[PDB]
Amino acid sequence: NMLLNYVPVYVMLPLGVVNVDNVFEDPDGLKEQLLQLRAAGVDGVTVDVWWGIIELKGPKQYDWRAYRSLLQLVQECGLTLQAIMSFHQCGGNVGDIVNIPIPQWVLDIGESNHDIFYTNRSGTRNKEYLTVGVDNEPIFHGRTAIEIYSDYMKSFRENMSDFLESGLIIDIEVGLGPAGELRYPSYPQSQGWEFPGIGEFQCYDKYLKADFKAAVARAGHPEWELPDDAGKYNDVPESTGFFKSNGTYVTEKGKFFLTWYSNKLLNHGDQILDEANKAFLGCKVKLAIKVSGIHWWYKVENHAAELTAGYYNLNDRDGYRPIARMLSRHHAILNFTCLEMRDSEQPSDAKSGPQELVQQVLSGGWREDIRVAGENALPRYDATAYNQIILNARPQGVNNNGPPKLSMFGVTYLRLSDDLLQKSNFNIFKKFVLKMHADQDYCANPQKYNHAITPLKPSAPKIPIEVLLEATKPTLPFPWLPETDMKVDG
Numbered sequence: 001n002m003l004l005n006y007v008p009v010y011v012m013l014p015l016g017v018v019n020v021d022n023v024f025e026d027p028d029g030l031k032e033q034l035l036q037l038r039a040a041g042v043d044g045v046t047v048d049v050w051w052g053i054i055e056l057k058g059p060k061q062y063d064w065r066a067y068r069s070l071l072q073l074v075q076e077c078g079l080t081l082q083a084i085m086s087f088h089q090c091g092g093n094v095g096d097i098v099n100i101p102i103p104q105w106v107l108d109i110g111e112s113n114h115d116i117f118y119t120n121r122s123g124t125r126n127k128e129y130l131t132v133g134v135d136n137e138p139i140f141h142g143r144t145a146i147e148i149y150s151d152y153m154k155s156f157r158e159n160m161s162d163f164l165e166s167g168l169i170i171d172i173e174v175g176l177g178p179a180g181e182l183r184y185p186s187y188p189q190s191q192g193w194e195f196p197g198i199g200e201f202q203c204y205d206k207y208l209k210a211d212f213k214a215a216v217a218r219a220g221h222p223e224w225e226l227p228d229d230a231g232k233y234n235d236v237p238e239s240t241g242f243f244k245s246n247g248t249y250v251t252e253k254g255k256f257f258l259t260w261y262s263n264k265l266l267n268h269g270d271q272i273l274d275e276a277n278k279a280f281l282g283c284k285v286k287l288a289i290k291v292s293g294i295h296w297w298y299k300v301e302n303h304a305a306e307l308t309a310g311y312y313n314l315n316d317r318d319g320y321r322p323i324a325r326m327l328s329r330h331h332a333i334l335n336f337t338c339l340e341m342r343d344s345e346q347p348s349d350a351k352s353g354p355q356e357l358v359q360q361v362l363s364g365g366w367r368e369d370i371r372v373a374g375e376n377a378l379p380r381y382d383a384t385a386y387n388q389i390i391l392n393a394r395p396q397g398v399n400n401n402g403p404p405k406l407s408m409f410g411v412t413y414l415r416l417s418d419d420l421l422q423k424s425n426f427n428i429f430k431k432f433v434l435k436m437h438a439d440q441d442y443c444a445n446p447q448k449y450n451h452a453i454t455p456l457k458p459s460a461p462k463i464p465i466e467v468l469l470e471a472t473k474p475t476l477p478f479p480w481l482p483e484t485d486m487k488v489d490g
């Protein structure tokens with residue numbers, strides 16, 4: 001039955017639906033919009049549950065009231081919800097039209113210890129997310145960074161227990177870095193970065209620097225230092241000593257560094273997912289993480305932008321499949337934040353391969369047998385963008401004889417706004433939804449399309465780093481259709 005080809009669609013809510021003062025500003029206005037979404041067949045909505053808003057007053061001083069009101073309204077409107085545990089700041093990344101810092105009490109600690117922030121070679125501290133360097137340092141009034149994240153999720157679970165039991169929440173997206181994605185803040189607009197700059201390594205805080213020095217010493221090269229020839233944010237690879245042909249990135253020193261740098265992210269994600277699994281154990285919800293889509297420089301040997309962001313991906317080394325393998329033990333979903341782009345839409349001097357990157361990432365996930373989801377990177381309202389999203393959702397089209405061999409677990413659309421509801425735009429959006437649903441009407445019971453959610457089980461045993469890195473072996477991607485068989489047209 002065709003319903004087996006159904007891929008659910010979710011819509012991200014406006015940034016700041018509950019403001020920095022923890023107030024659900026305009027319920028009536030949101031309601032009108034939500035009702036239009038429900039009428040259009042949208043399965044659910046997505047929202048940031050901001051750490052800086054909820055635990056503002058002080059350690060474990062949570063206030064869930066405003067969010068309880070929002071969830072209540074969402075439920076009343078007949079929509080499901082994807083909740084993002086947002087442990088990051090809103091404001092310095094593309095589209096961030098509102099400023100929401102992390103808890104002030106944490107920022108106060110940052111005044112006496114600047115090394116709790118990601119730091120670049122020049123010494124500039126980025127305050128949008130706590131460096132992985134302090135994940136296990138008990139410097140926050142007795143707690144470590146991971147314990148803070150853990151306590152937060154447990155409080156959410158307990159205080160929103162009625163919504164969880166009633167099945168309102170479909171999945172919990174655990175924020176793991178800038179913009180909620182598992183990556184280093186290598187391309188900060190707040191520091192002057194501009195596409196398609198290669199970005200900069202963010203491993204200069206005292207915690208990461210010390211870990212590196214100890215590591216190279218144990219490797220027999222105590223004299224090795226962090227990269228000093230990688231250039232600046234807006235450089236091009238060929239103008240740097242680190243990324244040029246036969247440059248530092250290909251030397252024993254460079255390879256060791258890149259492995260160390262990317263490994264920190266894998267472990268960061270694995271340890272926090274462990275806590276998320278314990279916090280939501282038994283609940284009918286799934287776990288998910290977000291991976292950034294860094295398509296610029298993907299078509300040159302150095303893959304410079306990916307490397308500075310923490311994804312050690314080269315033409316002969318898969319830097320994404322190891323992440324997918326790590327996710328399997330947690331039975332988590334890999335959410336890829338860039339599915340609507342086409343190579344031809346990118347300037348040629350950027351050497352961008354968004355289409356190829358998507359194929360590589362989704363294929364790796366399916367090969368590791370995990371579920372994969374995604375979202376468009378930039379606001380788009382045209383047919384071509386929707387058709388590309390639909391192609392990626394079902395790479396080999398629909399199957400009239402049963403379920404498709406390949407399909408994404410869901411797609412989240414960024415973002416709900418007055419522009420989207422404009423007559424003509426919303427008209428196209430409705431067709432996008434219909435096509436994602438494979439020409440079927442909105443289906444309220446997820447079980448009908450094999451998306452039933454069972455109680456979250458405990459995570460499987462820890463997978464050693466060496467086994468994770470075996471996933472770096474390059475593999476051929478699954479075959480992709482040149483265009484979707486379920487086009488929106490125009």
Ligand SMILES: OC[C@H]1O[C@H](O[C@H]2[C@H](O)[C@@H](O)[C@@H](O)O[C@@H]2CO)[C@H](O)[C@@H](O)[C@@H]1O
Pocket residue numbers: 012048084086088089090091093094095096179180181290292293337338375376377378
């Ligand atoms: O509201 C979710 C999330 O949205 C923004 O980050 C997006 C980004 O704009 C996209 O281009 C892509 O990278 O996915 C990101 C995460 O969904 C905000 O910048 C971020 O703070 C917020 O959590």
Ligand SMILES: OC[C@H]1O[C@@H](O)[C@H](O)[C@@H](O)[C@@H]1O
Pocket residue numbers: 094195
């Ligand atoms: O915010 C950065 C964005 O700027 C836009 O002008 C470009 O078209 C995007 O490709 C880029 O990601």
